Design a protein around this ligand. Structure first.
Ligand code: HEM
Length: 154
């Protein structure tokens, strides 16, 4: 699949807003993910002890992790589809070291859309959400293909 320049513009326009507060968006997204799909929390040995949203918000390590994740995702989105090089190491660590099923990538994609919808309604209307979903589907599709080449079905 391929996004048009118009769709990329919608994606990058709302992403520019997210970059005004990467740490904050990172926390909201992971808290949403962990609360909505608690099973994903078990994949993080560093955070699986967190019991409440309050503890999650107060975790300095979780906040730093969120920044690392969103920074990596932002770099991929800014490539506008030409992300082969960026995807290689990400696909290897998540398939081989962390063992993250494609299903879980769908869950975090849902969390990202939910947070952008809540925080940026004016810049995240129907068309913008469709563009973001398409960009994330492309990401998940290419990651899945790499998973297979690497020997991980998940
Ligand atoms: C938007 C998709 C995602 C991106 C861009 C992303 C990115 C990253 C990055 C850059 C790191 C640090 C470097 C590395 O280990 O490769 C990381 C670590 C990790 N990711 Fe992801 N990730 C994504 C989704 C997920 C999901 C859905 C899970 C599982 C629910 C997951 C689990 C992990 C784990 C367990 C680590 C190691 C954390 C640690 O122990 O420090 N990731 N991820």
């Amino acid at each position: 699949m391929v996004l048009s320049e118009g769709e990329w513009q919608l994606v990058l326009h709302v992403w520019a807003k997210v970059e005004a507060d990467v740490a904050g968006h990172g926390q909201d997204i992971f808290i949403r993910l962990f609360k909505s799909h608690p099973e994903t929390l078990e994949k993080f040995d560093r955070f699986k002890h967190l019991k409440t949203e309050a503890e999650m918000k107060a975790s300095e390590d979780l906040k730093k992790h969120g920044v690392t994740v969103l920074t990596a995702l932002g770099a991929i989105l800014k490539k506008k589809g030409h992300h082969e090089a960026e995807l290689k190491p990400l696909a290897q660590s998540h398939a081989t070291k962390h063992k993250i099923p494609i299903k879980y990538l769908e869950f975090i994609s849902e969390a990202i859309i939910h947070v952008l919808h809540s925080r940026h309604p004016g810049n995240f209307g129907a068309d913008a959400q469709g563009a973001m979903n398409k960009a994330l589907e492309l990401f998940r599709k290419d990651i899945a293909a790499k998973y297979k080449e690497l020997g991980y079905q998940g």
